Structure formats: C-alpha cells, structure tokens
C-alpha cells in the first residue's frame, strides 16, 4: 500500500506529459511543418524517457498482498515497459523515418504525366479517381502513379523502419516487433482466464476458415458484376484487378456497390445522393451522429471537441493528415479529425471515430495507466457497433434520409454491409501476416514485392495490373503501414462487433434478425455497454468480453448469422460464374 | 528554503492537556508525511505519531493524543487530551517521505 | 511489533581512527536509514539510504548492511563527530527506532 503515493506523482507529471507528447502530435497532423515536427519530437522524447525512468523506479517496487487492487494494477502496467530501448542515433533516426513516411504519404505529390506541373493529392483527389471513376486507363494511372511516385520513395524508409522496429521489441523482451503487437492481447497470470502472444495467430487462421465460404461467393459474384462494368479487362476465372475494386488499395469494397446492387429499382439504402440533396455539413453528420449515442444513454461531445477538431479538410495550402483520427489528448481533451466528406462513407465513419471518444470518456473514470482500452480490437469495435446499428435501412428511414417505405431490400442492404465489411477479412489477414513475416525475418528484401503479389492473388484473390519490380513498397502506400500502426486490429475487430451487436440485441429487446437490429432509445443496451466502455484496462480483454457477451474470445459465429441470408442468395446467383480464382491470372 | 518550525506550551498540569503546533515551507506541504516524534530527557526517540490524509499513533499516546493538519495553513498539529507525567519530553516535529527537524520544544508534566 | 537495537550500546574511540557502529534489526532486511544527533540539538539524517550520504553530509561517511545487520563507519574520525547514533526503520506499519548508541571521542 505504500507505493500509491508514488502513483499521484507519476499520475500528475504524466498526464502534463502524456498531453504536452498528445497535443504536438495533434499539431502536427493538423498544421503539417517544422513548428511542430520538432515540437512532437522533443515532447515525444520527454514522454518517452518519462515512461523508460518511471518503469525503472516502478521495479523498485515489488507487487505483492496490496489489497486496494488500484494501486495492483498501476503497478502491473509500470511494470510493461520499455527499458534502454534505444541510443541517441537510433531514436533520431526513427524519428525522421517516420516524421518522413507520414509526411510522404500525407503530402505525396502524383504528377499529371501530361503536364509535368500539375499535381494531385491522394486525399482528396487520386482518391476520388479509385472511389468514383469507373474508367480502367484513368483508374489505373491513379493506382500506379501513386505506388510509383510515392509508393517507391516509402520502399527504404519501411526498410529501415524494419531493422530498427525489430532490434526495439527484442529490447523489451519481445520476439519480433509483431510479437510487440501481438501481445496486446496477452492476458497473464490470471488462472482461469488467459490469453498468448501466440494464440492470436492461431485464433485468426482457424476462424479465418469459416469466412472462405461467404467471401469466395462475394468474390465471384463482384467479379461477374464487374466484368459488366470493364468488359473485355476481367477474367470470368482469375483474381480481380486491384485498381478495380473501388479504392487505390483493393480494401473496402464499399464503392462497388454502385455496381454491385442486387435490386437496382429499389429506392437507394446508400444516401450519399440523399445527404448531398440535404446540403448536409461536415458538422450535421457529427451532431447526427452524437445524438445516436445520446439515444444509446451516452453524453454529448464536449465543447473543446467542437471547437478544436479539425471535421473538414483544411485549405489546399495547409497540408494535413487526413485519415480519420480520433483523440484521447488527455486531461479531458478530445478531438477528431475527419476531413469529412457528404457522404454515407464518412457518415458511418463518424459514428466510428465518435464511438473511439466516447469509450475515452468512460474510462476516464480510471486512473491513467488503465486508460487504454480493453484491447486494440475492442477499440475498434466500440465504433463499429453503433455504425452497424445507424446503418440499418430502418434508422436511416427515421433520421431522415430515407423517405417513407422487403426479401429484395434486405439482400439490397445485406450486399452493401458485406462489400465493406467482409471484403476487408482477407485483405487483413494478408497485410499484417506479410508484415509478421518481414519482421520475424522470414521474407528477405529480394522477395518482399514477390511475397505481396503471391499473396495476393492466392489469399485475396486481386492481381497486380503491372508486375512491380522490388523498387516499390505497395504496402507502406497504406495509411496505417505508412503511419506507423497495427492492422491486426481490424480482423479481430470485426468478430468482436457482431458477437456485441448480438448481445446488445437482446438488451434492447430486438426478437430478430440481427441483420435489422439498431441501438436506439435504449437504456438497456448503453447501461450494457458503458458498464464496460469505463473499464478500460483494469479487467483483461478476455473477461470485458465476457461481461458482454457469452464468449471469453473473438468468435466468428454470430458474424456469418448477420449475413446468411446473403450467402444463401450468393449460392443462388453464383451458379452461372466460377467460384474460386485462379493463383496465376494477370491482365500482363 | 526547507524550514520547520515549532511552538507550542511548555508545563502543563498531570491530566491536562495542550497543543503543539508546527509550520512547514520551503516545499508542498501535502507531498510529505509528517510526524512527531518525542524525546523524554534519558531515552531514546520514540515516534508518536504519523499522517499521511491517515493518521496513526504508536500505541503509547493513541488513547490521549490526536494528530490533525491544516494543509493551508502548512502546519502540523499534536493535540494532547489527557497528558501523564510519563509523556514529558522535547517534541519535535520532521518531514518523512516515500528529512528536516525543527527544533524541538519542551512541553514538562508535572504538578 | 518491529523492534532494533545496535550492537556497541556506547563507544569510545580516539581522532582519526576508523569506527564502526552496528545496529541489528529483529525481522527484516530493509533500506536502513542513519542519524547524527549532537547533544542538546535535533537529530540530522545522516544516510539517507543504506551507501547513500545525506546531503551536505561529507565523504568520511560511510553506510552499509545486508541481513538484519546494517553498519555505519567513519574513515578518519573527527574531533567534532561526538554525538548519539540512531537508526530508523521506514519499514513497517509500526515505526520505530532502537537502543542508541552514543560516541565519546578520546584524546
């Protein structure tokens, strides 16, 4: 009990550090220049040699018999540390790496070949030409521009980021900088439940195995579909184009659905062309957004949200960070940075990163070291719940976007959810498998471009439009690559987000179909939740689970029951296409 | 500078009572622990007693003394309730930690 | 409770020479912490830590101990280190200090 005196003093100095380190970075990604890349590197080495001095003092103090378990577990995660990671050079070198690779890929130029001057951002430019253009030439020059112009650039700098990333993780006693990641879900020493850093990959491949059913259906059935779209370009049998699948990395197939809609006479579920007739602002879908979760039971955003996030893109001459970003500054400080657009995407994505806040102001209520999240997939999840739930064509109906008012309109829906969600599985599990195996050392640098292609059309079923030389680094084109970030999270994420829809879909006394079910006018589903939003780190992932859900681990189950109904139509409609790809096809 | 400074009554009626008084500077006041400790003319040092805001008390004075703050003020209290010829000493008062003394003061029980 | 008491109760040592002055605890091996008491004025920390010096506290200081035993020594005794040794325990929920031991210095 004597070392909970320490704990205020290392609470106080690191919550005016954690938020000095928080805020620079916010500067940065909001005012991109040298301002505030030495500010974030100066206060990031401050926060980090902090951490590196608090640990050391933490471990002379041994844990044992302290009753008050707040003081147990402030302890517990002292004693996670990083301890004499890194020399001066090696901590300046990581910096500029990645104080570059986020500049690049927020900043990266794509010439206009027919006019050497001009020039196009990915955000929000090439990006529309890969969303919206459904000409192969133009899609193409977008896709490749990048990867060649900026993706190249990036190639020797994740080369470096590699060699240096993995010596840091043996430093603190980790197998590989993807075991660093991996043990976010470690649960140790506790006896009856118990997670390794291991059993992660072991988890998502045999899980993985169920998807193949659902996902090669919507496979073949997006190849058919496409082919109606870039007729003599796409093989009936082999793997799709990448430039093709609706944006510049082949993740979400949201975008093909313009092309994918089962019952195209239905009145449209996907209301961008709604949310532009209404002249909606970047501020109406965020207010939208925070009264679902009002209606969940959850508090309003707080007014230094509204008046210090940055919702919109900034003008052309302030160059920014632009993916969607959500904040726990600390001190009670919250930000978001959307740069949102009108559109159904970036609404979804509100509710997203709104979700990410409001699971920072629950467990707040815990103290510093505990304000983390269950896991990376639970943060992730939160958001995903209640977007799943705003999506419904009911809420949307209620809201206002939907008109007043079907078998066909619910597979009309059920696709739309499938193209975003499931076709996001297997590109996950193939970008952070690459990853691991570059990092354990097992892809040498003459294969790594080899091994991304092999993986592509073998796991995902998508082909390079040109055979890529090993100067490229297509997967570091990638925001979350680029930025330093784990894409793990999302596979997990996106089993835990059904096995809490369904839990919640009986507090909120739903007797259905999940595929229908909203959390909205619920006391009885945000009571559910935020009994587990405000735990934060103090009770391992695998009991929050089970404290929600029936399940003390990421189950895929409740998934595939979300979108049966769309893998029977998918059996149906299918028998006129092949199924599976073939590993060699390329339009080369 | 670390400063502390003491005062307080000097004989006291057997049965009385009295309280003794300690300011603090130089520092914050509530990141310490502080303490009296007493020293009767022929023994050692013996601690009377301490305060986080807990407050504890060797077994000898908790039935007759009470240690209270006013952390505003900077100061640091020992109340004596019921006062013994046994408890005559010099009382001094200290800064624990996870030291300074001020100078202590004579506080004689006898009729 | 926890008690101590130190080994040499008094000790008489001549100028210059090299003392020691033991104190034994009953229970524990913890971080000891050293006084110098002068006569007629407060007892001053003299190792705030176990080898760690008190500041303003001058190199003929020494501390030491493992065990229930911890030690203080004086390299070249000085003519003004005539004073009462104590020792405290930071340990436990009973605080405490034991048998002092005072220094008389020869000539």
């Known amino acids: 009990e004597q070392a909970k005196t320490f704990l205020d003093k290392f609470n106080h100095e690191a919550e005016d550090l954690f938020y000095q380190s928080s805020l620079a970075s916010w500067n940065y990604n909001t005012n991109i220049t040298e301002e505030n890349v030495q500010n974030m590197n100066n206060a990031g080495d401050k926060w980090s040699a902090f951490l590196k001095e608090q640990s050391t003092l933490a471990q002379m103090y041994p844990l044992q018999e302290i009753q008050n378990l707040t003081v147990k577990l402030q302890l517990q995660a002292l004693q996670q540390n990083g301890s004499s990671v890194l020399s001066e050079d090696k901590s300046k070198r990581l910096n500029t790496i990645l104080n570059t690779m986020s500049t690049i890929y927020s900043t990266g130029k794509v010439c206009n070949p027919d006019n050497p001057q001009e020039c196009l951002l990915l955000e929000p430019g090439l990006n529309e030409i890969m969303a919206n253009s459904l000409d192969y030439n133009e899609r193409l020059w977008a896709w490749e521009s990048w990867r060649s112009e900026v993706g190249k650039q990036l190639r020797p700098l994740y080369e470096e980021y590699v060699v240096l990333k993995n010596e840091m993780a043996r430093a603190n006693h980790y197998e590989d900088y993807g075991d660093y990641w991996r043990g976010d879900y470690e649960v140790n020493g506790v006896d009856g439940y118990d997670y390794s850093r291991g059993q992660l990959i072991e988890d998502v491949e045999h899980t993985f195995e169920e998807i193949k059913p659902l996902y090669e259906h919507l496979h073949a059935y997006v190849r058919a579909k496409l082919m109606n779209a870039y007729p003599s370009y796409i093989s009936p049998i082999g793997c799709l184009p990448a430039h093709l699948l609706g944006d510049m990395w082949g993740r979400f197939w949201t975008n093909l659905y313009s092309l994918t809609v089962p019952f195209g006479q239905k009145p449209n579920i996907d209301v961008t062309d709604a949310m532009v007739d209404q002249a909606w602002d970047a501020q109406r879908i965020f207010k939208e957004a925070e009264k679902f979760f009002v209606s969940v039971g959850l508090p309003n955003m707080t007014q230094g949200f509204w008046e210090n996030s940055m919702l919109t893109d900034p003008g052309n001459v302030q160059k920014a960070v632009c993916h969607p970003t959500a904040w726990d500054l600390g001190k009670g400080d919250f930000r978001i940075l959307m740069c949102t657009k009108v559109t159904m995407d970036d609404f979804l994505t509100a509710h997203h990163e709104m979700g990410h806040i409001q699971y920072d102001m629950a467990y707040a209520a815990q103290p510093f070291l505990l304000r983390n999240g269950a896991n990376e997939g639970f943060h992730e999840a939160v958001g995903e719940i209640m977007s799943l739930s705003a999506a419904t064509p009911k809420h949307l109906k209620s809201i206002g976007l939907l008109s007043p008012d079907d078998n066909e309109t619910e597979i009309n829906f059920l696709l739309k959810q499938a193209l975003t969600i499931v076709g996001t599985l297997p590109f996950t599990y193939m970008l952070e498998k690459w990853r691991w195996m570059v990092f354990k050392g097992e892809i040498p640098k003459d294969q790594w471009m080899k091994k991304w292609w092999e993986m592509k059309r073998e796991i995902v079923g998508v082909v390079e439009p040109v055979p890529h030389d090993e100067t490229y680094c297509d997967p570091a084109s990638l925001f979350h690559v680029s930025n330093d970030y784990s894409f793990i999270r999302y596979y997990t994420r996106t089993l835990y987000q059904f096995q809490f829809q369904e839990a919640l879909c009986q507090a909120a006394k739903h007797e259905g179909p999940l595929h229908k079910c909203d959390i909205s006018n619920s006391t009885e589903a945000g009571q559910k939740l935020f009994n587990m939003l405000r735990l934060g780190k103090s009770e391992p992932w695998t009991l929050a689970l089970e404290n929600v859900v029936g399940a003390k681990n990421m189950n895929v189950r409740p998934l595939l029951n979300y979108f049966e109904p769309l893998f029977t139509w998918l059996k149906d409609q299918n028998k006129n296409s092949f199924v599976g790809w073939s590993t060699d096809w390329s339009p080369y | 500078e670390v400063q502390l400074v003491e005062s307080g009554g000097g004989l006291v009626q057997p049965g009385g009572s009295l309280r003794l008084s300690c300011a603090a500077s130089g520092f914050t006041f509530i990141d310490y622990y502080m303490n009296w400790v007493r020293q009767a003319p022929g023994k050692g040092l013996e601690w009377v007693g301490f305060?986080?805001?807990?407050?504890e008390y060797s077994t000898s004075v908790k039935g007759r003394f009470t240690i209270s703050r006013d952390n505003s003020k900077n100061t640091l209290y020992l109340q004596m309730n019921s006062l013994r010829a046994e408890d005559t000493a010099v009382y001094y008062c200290?800064?624990?930690?996870?030291?300074?003394w001020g100078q202590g003061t004579l506080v004689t029980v006898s009729s | 409770d926890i008690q101590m008491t130190q080994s040499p109760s008094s000790l008489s040592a001549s100028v210059g020479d090299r003392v020691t002055i033991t104190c034994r605890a009953s229970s524990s091996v913890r971080y000891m912490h050293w006084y110098q008491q002068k006569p007629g004025k407060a007892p001053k920390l003299l190792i705030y830590?176990?080898?760690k010096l008190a500041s303003g506290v001058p190199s003929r200081f020494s501390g030491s101990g493992s065990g229930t035993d911890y030690t203080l020594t004086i390299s070249s005794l000085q003519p003004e280190d005539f004073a009462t040794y104590y020792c405290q325990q930071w340990s436990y929920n009973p605080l405490t200090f034991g048998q002092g031991t005072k220094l008389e210095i020869k000539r």
């Open positions: 830590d176990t080898s």
């Open positions: 305060i986080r805001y807990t407050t």
């Open positions: 200290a800064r624990h930690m996870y030291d300074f």
